[PDB]
């Protein structure tokens, strides 16, 4: 009874749960065991904490070449896309007033609490910072990110030559009366539904999977379109703790089989299975590639 261990992004929980079941049906001798976590945390388990996985599936393919290669990974495959949206429920404050035009203005109200995951552990979290900074450029309003996050946290930004570098400290400290933060984006669903906070920055796929209402954000800032990569790259984020800088770019998921994977043959079969079954991603809200 071979155990195929998978460390995957929290946003992949729904589709990968399906892949697990489908794969096991075709390979009855394999027991797929998934461990969901923010993608940066997934990578950390492997390159720093000595944990063995057969598959590492990240919400941002970037983490593989930037953190795993070549010691823990030799290659990777890009297999899915996504975009950031602003999710909410009927319990959220001003939910019948907010729209695609005034969203960032509503979020600036003192009584509105916003949620996002920790940039140190999850791409959805660092992407949220990128999205808000990109919003200043698109709307030509230099106060958005400063008013929503900088004045409510210890995150800082350096501007030079028209580009931006967001500096995320190892120990993130936020004003909890304004910002609701947890390790990975999927950790924020339960609190949102319970009305712990009002608006949640999260992937469109996850919002649709959990039947959440959401406001669509501009293609110029939501990281979902390759045609806007030149605009996205004007912003980058540095995870100070690891001295790694990641450019804002179109959301593309990446997968690899670690160099120390216990069952490489079966791991590769799984990777191919996923690529051969894009409908699982599409039918669950994610644009396959």
Which SS3 state, helix, strand or coil, does residue 145 take?
helix
**CA 3, CA 200: separation in Å to the nearest integer?**
35
Q: Is 123 annotated as a binding residue?
A: yes
Give the tokens for residue 138: 């698109």
> Does the annotation flag 115 for ligand binding?
no
Q: Note whether 273 and 74 are within 8 A (CB).
A: no
Which run of H or of E encompasses 179? Answer: strand 179-182
> Breaks in the chain follow which residues, C to N over 2.5 Å?
none
Is 39 known as a binding-site position?
yes
Tell me: is residue 92 an annotated ligand-binding position: no
- Does 13 show up as a binding residue in the annotation? no
Strand partners, 3: 31
**Other Cβ atoms within 10 Å of 289 Cβ, number:** 15
Q: How many of the other CB atoms lie within 10 Å of CB of 34?
A: 17
Distance between CA atoms of 28 and 50, rounded to whole angstroms? 29
Both tokens of 182, joined, read 């947890």
Residue 42 in marked binding region:
no
Residue ranges of the annotated binding site for molybdate are 10-11, 39, 122-124, 185, 203
Which residue positions form the known binding site?
10-11, 39, 122-124, 185, 203
Annotated binding site for tungstate: 10-11, 39, 122-124, 185, 203
């Amino acid at each position: 009874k071979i155990v195929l261990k998978i460390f995957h992004a929290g946003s992949l929980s729904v589709p990968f749960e399906e892949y697990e079941k489908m794969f096991e049906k075709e390979h009855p001798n394999v027991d797929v065991e998934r461990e969901p976590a923010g993608s940066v945390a997934c990578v950390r388990k492997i390159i720093d904490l000595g944990k063995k996985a057969d598959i590492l599936a990240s919400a941002d393919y970037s983490l593989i070449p930037q953190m795993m290669m070549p010691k823990y990974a030799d290659w990777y495959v890009m297999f899915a896309r996504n975009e950031i949206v602003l999710a909410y429920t009927d319990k959220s404050k001003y939910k019948d007033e907010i729209n695609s035009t005034n969203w960032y203005k509503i979020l600036q109200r003192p009584d509105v609490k916003i949620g996002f995951s920790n940039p140190n552990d999850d791409p959805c979290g660092y992407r949220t910072q990128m999205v808000l900074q990109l919003a200043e450029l698109y709307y030509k309003d230099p106060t958005i990110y400063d008013n929503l996050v900088l004045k409510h946290s210890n995150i800082k930004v350096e501007e030079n030559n028209g580009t931006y570098l967001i500096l995320v400290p190892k120990e993130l400290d936020v004003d909890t009366n304004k910002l609701f933060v947890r390790s990975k984006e999927t950790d924020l669903l339960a609190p949102l539904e319970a009305g712990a906070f009002d608006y949640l920055f999260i992937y469109k796929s996850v919002a649709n999977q959990h039947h959440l209402k959401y406001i669509e954000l501009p293609k110029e800032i939501n990281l979902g379109y390759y045609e806007y990569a030149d605009t996205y790259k004007k912003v980058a984020l540095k995870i100070i703790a690891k001295n790694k800088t990641i450019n804002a770019k179109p959301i593309v998921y990446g997968m690899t089989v670690p160099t120390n994977a216990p069952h490489k043959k079966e791991a590769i079969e799984f990777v191919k299975f996923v690529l051969g079954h894009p409908e699982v991603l599409e039918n669950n809200g994610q644009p396959a590639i």
